[PDB]
Symmetry: D2
Amino acid sequence: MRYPEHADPVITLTAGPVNAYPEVLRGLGRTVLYDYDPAFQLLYEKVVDKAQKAMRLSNKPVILHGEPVLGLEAAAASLISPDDVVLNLASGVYGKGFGYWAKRYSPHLLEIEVPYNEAIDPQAVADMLKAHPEITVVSVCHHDTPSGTINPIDAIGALVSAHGAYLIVDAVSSFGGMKTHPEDCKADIYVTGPNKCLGAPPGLTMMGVSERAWAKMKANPLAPRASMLSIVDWENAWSRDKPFPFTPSVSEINGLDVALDLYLNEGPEAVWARHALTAKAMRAGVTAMGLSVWAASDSIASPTTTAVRTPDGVDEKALRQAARARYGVVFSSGRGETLGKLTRIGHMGPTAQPIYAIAALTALGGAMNAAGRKLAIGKGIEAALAVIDADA
Amino acid sequence: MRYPEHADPVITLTAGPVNAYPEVLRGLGRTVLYDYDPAFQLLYEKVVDKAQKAMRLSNKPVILHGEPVLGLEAAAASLISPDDVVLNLASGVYGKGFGYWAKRYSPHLLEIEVPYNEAIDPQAVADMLKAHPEITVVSVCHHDTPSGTINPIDAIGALVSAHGAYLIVDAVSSFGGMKTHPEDCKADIYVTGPNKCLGAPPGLTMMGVSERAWAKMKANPLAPRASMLSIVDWENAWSRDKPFPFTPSVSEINGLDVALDLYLNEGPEAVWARHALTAKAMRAGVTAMGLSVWAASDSIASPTTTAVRTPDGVDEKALRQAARARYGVVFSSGRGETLGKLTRIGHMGPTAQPIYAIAALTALGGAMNAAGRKLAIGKGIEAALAVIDADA
Amino acid sequence: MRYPEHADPVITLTAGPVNAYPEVLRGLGRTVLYDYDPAFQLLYEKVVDKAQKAMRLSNKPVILHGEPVLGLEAAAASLISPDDVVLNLASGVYGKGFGYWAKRYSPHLLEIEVPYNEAIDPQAVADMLKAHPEITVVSVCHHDTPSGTINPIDAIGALVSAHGAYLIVDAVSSFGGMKTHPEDCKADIYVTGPNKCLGAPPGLTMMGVSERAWAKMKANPLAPRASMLSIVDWENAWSRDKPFPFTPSVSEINGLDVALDLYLNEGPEAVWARHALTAKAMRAGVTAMGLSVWAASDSIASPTTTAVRTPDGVDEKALRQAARARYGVVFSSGRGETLGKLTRIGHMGPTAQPIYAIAALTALGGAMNAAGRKLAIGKGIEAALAVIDADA
Amino acid sequence: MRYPEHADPVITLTAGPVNAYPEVLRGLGRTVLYDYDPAFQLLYEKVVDKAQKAMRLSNKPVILHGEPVLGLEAAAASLISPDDVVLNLASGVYGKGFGYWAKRYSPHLLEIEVPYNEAIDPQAVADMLKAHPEITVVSVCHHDTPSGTINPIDAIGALVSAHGAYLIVDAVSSFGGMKTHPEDCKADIYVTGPNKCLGAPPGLTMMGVSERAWAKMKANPLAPRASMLSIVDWENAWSRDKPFPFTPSVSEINGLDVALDLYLNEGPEAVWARHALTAKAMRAGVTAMGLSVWAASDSIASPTTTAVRTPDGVDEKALRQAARARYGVVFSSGRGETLGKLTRIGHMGPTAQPIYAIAALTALGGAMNAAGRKLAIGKGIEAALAVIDADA
Ligand SMILES: Cc1ncc(CO)c(CN)c1O
Ligand SMILES: Cc1ncc(CO)c(CN)c1O
Ligand SMILES: Cc1ncc(CO)c(CN)c1O
Ligand SMILES: Cc1ncc(CO)c(CN)c1O
C-alpha cells in the first residue's frame, strides 16, 4: 500500500509543527470572547501568570502575537542600539541568521561560528569577551533546530553576565523539552513559543525580559513603538485593567492556556525526562542500525530533535517521500546549509514519547533500505528498546 | 440576577471579536500538519485560491501571519517611500491612525479630515487631487469601525486611479459583510482579514496586491525584507512548490479554510443581505425607541456595525457594564476619539442575523432605562420587527 | 429573508434537545479511552461521584447507557412485581404513559388523572392512599414536559412514605433546572438525565436508587438481568475495580463529566434561579402581548418550559414553521393530546437565560401576527424586561 | 520512566474502544439540533441512507439508540418465539452468549460448539440442518472478538437459507474492516455498530433487517413494543416525515454521520485492505519473535484483531499492565473463557495502519521479555516490515 501525498499522514514526527496535544486542539475551539470583555481580560492576565510560572520567571513574561521570529526580530530592534557592540554566536542556521538582524541595528558585529554539527565552546566565548571588552550584547541559540544540536547557554550566560553585557537567547525549540529558563542562563531577552515542545500550533511568542533589558529598551528612542515589532508597547498589557496595543490572537491564547496547564500539571521535570529518553532511545537505534547521528558528539545532541546524517548516495528528499508514502510517517528536512544533508526526527510535546522513537526508527530504516542501504533495523529497535528498559 | 464579570457572557454582540462560527471553532481543532508536509502545502495553496475567489481577485491575495494591523503597517512600510506624497483620508480612528504610519515612511503628508460621524466627500477628494499633482499614494478606510460609518471607496478609488496614484484601502471590518473587493475600488493594496465579518478569530491578514504595487514595493530599498513587516518576502508562498518565509499559523489557516467555505457556500450576496437587514432593523429600533444613530446620515451607516450615540449625561462605560451585568449581552465601546461618545453593536458573520438585533435592542434599551432614560423599548422592538417582516 | 428548512436554525429554543453547552460539545470530543483502561475506570468512578454530589444523594446514583426512557422502563420492570398494587399519577402525556409500563409488570393498577394543563393534588393522593391501603408502589412525573406543568412531588412523596409505599419519580425535564433531588421527595427510584436542563445531548440516564429499592429489586427474580433493561447488573459498575455489564457510552460520559462540572461550578442554586427567572419573564411577556399560558395556574407552570395555548383558528404547526422560517427560532410542538393545542418554549441549561425569553417572545409574536393575530408584541417585551429588571 | 495508571496512555491498541477518528471527535461536537427540527429530520434520513449505502442494503437499515448488545438482545426478543427451534453456533464468547438470549425466548436450543480458537465448520452446519428439519432460526457471530477469529458466515448463511431458516448474524467487530454485508450472508438480522472498525465511540446499533424478518417480528405477540428492546417500533423512523419512538442520541448520530463519510470517501475496499495488511504484518511479527497466534489457523485469524496466546506461565494481566506502564500502549485482555489465555491487539479504523502493528509488536515483545521471555523482538519487527514492504 501507499499513502497519497494529498492525504493526511498517519504520524507526524517532524521537528515542528507536529500535531498539537488533543487537549490543545479542543482548547483552540473555546469561546472567542471580545478582547475587552472582562472575562477575557482576566483570562489573559491568568495566561501571563501561568507562563511566568512555567518559565520560573521573577517578573512577567511578555506574550507577543506572532510566532517567535517576531520576538527575535523585536529583540534585535529594541535591545541593539547603533553604538552597541554585538557578539553573535553561530552554530547553525538560526544562530547565523540572527547576526543579520543584529547588523540591521548596529554596524558593530563580532561573531564566533562553528561547523553546523558542533556546539559553541564557552571558553571561546570567554576568550572573545577578553579580547573585546567593548562587547555590550551577546546573542545565542539554544537548540539550533536544523542541526539538532544544543549550545551550553547557562555557562555562556554566566560569562556574558561576568562581562556586564546583555544576553539574547533563542530557546524556541528547547523550552519545555529540557531544563532551561530565563533565570538559568541569566538572559536579558529569552525568546520561546508554544509551537515546539509545548505542543501548540504556531502563532504566539513567549518572551522573558529582565528588568535591565526593560530599562535599556524604554530608554532607546529607536526601539519599535506603534509597531508589530514593539516589545515596549506590550509592557503592561498583561493587566486586566490595561488595553491591548492591537487585537490579541484570542484563539491562540485559548490554546496556550491549555498547553501551559498540561505542562504544569504533568510536571516540568517529568516532561523533560520523557523528551530526553525518547531522544536517547532514538540515537541508540540510529547508531545500532548502522546510521550516524549528525551531532559531532552525543553530549551536544538535542533531547528534542534527532538529526540523522544522510549516507553518501542517498537522496534525502526521496527518503522522506518514501517514509511518508510507505509508512505514513513524516520527518523534517534540514534547512539552509543542512538541507539535503540530514533528516530530522522531532521529539516534542505529544511526540516526546519513547514509543514514537520506535515508530520513527522503523520508518527511517525502511525508507533507507528501500534506497538500497542494508541497515540492521531489528538491531536498531532492540537498542532503542534497551534504552527505554534501562530507565524503567 | 447579575452576570459576574469573571463568568462568560450570554451573547457577544460587539464589533469584534465576536464568537467564531461554530464550524470555525471546530475547524481550529483540525490536525496541525507540518508546514512542509505535501498535504499542508496543497491545503495552503487551496486556501489562497479560496481567498482569491472570495475577493474576486485577478491575482493571488497574500496571507500574512498576524492580524490586519500587520497588513496596514507592512503596506505603509513597503509602498510608501520618502519620495512619495501621501494623501490620507481620515473620517475616524483607523483612517487618522493610518496617517501616522504614512508619516513614518514619508515626510510628505496631505490629509482630508471630516468629523468622526461623517464620510469623506468624493468631490473633496477630486478637488484635492486636482490641486496636488504631486500626490502619489492615497489611503482610505472603508468601514472605520469605531464610528460605524462607511466611505465611498469605489468612487474614491476611481478618482485616485485617474490621478495616477496608488490606493491603499483598509477593508478589515467591511469585507465579507457588504459588497466590496479590491477590483471594485481599484485598490493597489487592499487589507482585510477573517476576524470581523468572516467569523474567524484574530490572527491572519488577507491582502489584495496589484501588479503595480508589487513592482513599486520590490523596487523600494526601504521595503521590509527578512522581517515580520515584509510583504515582498511572501509573494510566492501561496505555491505548494515554494517555502514559507517563516512558519505559518497552521491552526489559523484551518480556521480560515472553514470561514471561506462557509462564505462561498452560503453565497456572498446572501451573506451581505443578512448583514444589511440586521443593521437596518437595528437602526430602525434605535431610532424608534428614542435614541440616535451616530452616523451623520443613515446612508453612511455601516451594514456591519451600528454605532449609537450616547445621550448627553449618560455614562457610556457604566451603560455597557450594565448591559452585560443585567442581560449578559456584550457591546463594544468606542475607540480613541469615539470612546465615551457612542456604543457599538456589531452585525458580523455569526451575529449578522436579525434576531440578534432584537436581543441587542432590548439589552441596550434596558441598560439606558436603568441609567434614567425613558426609552420606548417596545416601540423599538416593533420597528425592528417591521423591517424584518417587510424584507422582500 | 427566509431560513430554509434544510439549513441550521439561528436559535433552538425548544423543550429539548437544545444545543448543548459549548463546553459539553468540546467535551464530547475528548479522547475515547478503552473502557478497561485504568484511566477510564477512574474517570467513570469520578463521574458517578460528581453525579452523586449534584443529586445530593446519600448513596451512588446509577448511570444507565440509554436516554431516560430506559431508566423509566427499567424501573417499572424491576420495582413492580406481579403482586404489587400500583397507583399511577397522570397529569400529562408522560405520567399517563408510565401507567402502561406499570400494567406490563402488575395487573393491579389504580390511577389519579387530571386535565393536561393541571397538576396532581397531594390531597387527592392522600385520599386515594386512605381508600386503598393495599397500594405498594406510586409513580409520578415531576415536569410533564408536553404540558409545561409541575407536580408537587415533595408533598406527594411525603404521603407515599407515610403509607409505606415505594415512589418512582420521573424528573427528566426538571432536575438541574429547579430545586429537586431524590431525597427531597423521598424517592425510591428517581429517574433523570443530562439531556434537558443539564445541557448535554441524549444518551444517558442518571438514576437515584434508595437502599430499600435496592433490596426490593435484588429479591425480585423477575427484575431484568443480562439485559439492557437491567438496573441490578449495574449495582457495582461505578467502581474502578469492577467490570461494566456492557460497553459504556464513553463519549457521552465525557459530555456528562463536563455538564456536571458546569452545574456544580456555577452553583445549583444560581442555575435554578436563572431557569425560574427566564420562565417568569416568558410568562409575563406571553400574557402581556395577549396570549395565554397553557398551565391552569401560574403556580404550576414549569420554570424549565413555557407552554403557550394555541389561539382558535391558528395552525400551530404553521406557526412553528413561520417562527423558524422568518426569524430562525425553533420551538417545540406539543405531544400526544397536547399536539396542535400548544407551543413550547424551553428554558433549559444554555437556553435558561432571560435574554432568550426576549428572543422567543419576539419570534412567537411575529409568527402569531403573520397568522393574523394582532398581538401587542412591544408590550410583551416590556413586561418580560420588567420581570428581569425587578430581580436585578 | 513509567506511565501512571491515572494518566492517559500514549496509544490505545485495543480491540475497542479505541480513540475515535479525529474527524469523528470533531463531529461529536457538531450542533445538537432539536430532533423534530426539519434539518435534523433530514440529517437522520441521510444518515440512514449512508448506512444503507455502506451496508450495500436493498432496504433501510435500522439504527437503534444503544450499543450493539441492544441490537442482539432485541433481535432475540423479537425474532425468536417459543415455537422456534434455534441452532446457535458458538466458537467464542459472543457466539456462546447469544445462546443464553435464544434460550430466554425459546426453550428449544440446539448448538454447534467448537473451542474458542476455532471456526465453525460449514460441513457440520449442513449436517446439523439436515438432521434437524425443525430448526427455524440460526445464530452466528462473524468475528468473535475475544478470540480474534472469523466464522465463514457467507457459506453458513447460504446453507441456512437453503434449509428455510432465519439467520441472525453478529458482525459488530467485522463490518467496515473486511468484506461483509447483510446480502453477502443472506442475513435476516445483521447486527453491527460504528464502535469497532468504523472508528466511532459506543452508543449506536446499525441493523440490517430482511423483509421476511420484518414480517416475523411484526406478527409475534411477544416481540417488544413500546420498549427499549423494540425493533418493530423503529421501522419507519428513518423517514423525515415520521416521528422517533424515543429521543435519538443526537450527538452519536453526528459522530456516525462523519464515520460513514470517512468510510465511503476512502473506499470500503481500500479500508478493508489496510485492516488486513496491518493484521497480516502483526501476525508475521508475532510468529517471528517467538510467540503464537491464538487462532487454530492463520486462515481464520481476524483482519481486525490479532489475538496472541499467552505463554504458559506468563501472567497475562501483569503483561498488559507492563505494556501500558513501560511503553504507554494499551492492549485488550480476553473476555470470559479467553480471559487470561491471550492478549488482543486491535486493528480497527484509525488503528488499522501498519505502523501501529510495529508499535504494538515492540510493546508486546518488551512486556513479554520483562516477564522473562526471550523473544527475538528485532526479528519480529523485520518480519512485520517485510509484509508491509511486500504488499502489492
Ligand atoms: C531555533 C529556532 N529559532 C527560531 C525559530 C522561529 O520561530 C524557529 C522555528 N523554526 C527555530 O527552530
Ligand atoms: C477598520 C479596522 N482596521 C484595522 C483594524 C486592525 O485589525 C481593525 C480592528 N479593530 C479595524 O476595525
Ligand atoms: C417528562 C419526560 N419523561 C421522560 C422522558 C424520556 O426521556 C422525556 C423526554 N421527552 C420527558 O420529557
Ligand atoms: C462480537 C461482538 N458482539 C457484540 C458486542 C456488543 O457490542 C461486542 C462488543 N464487545 C462484540 O465484540
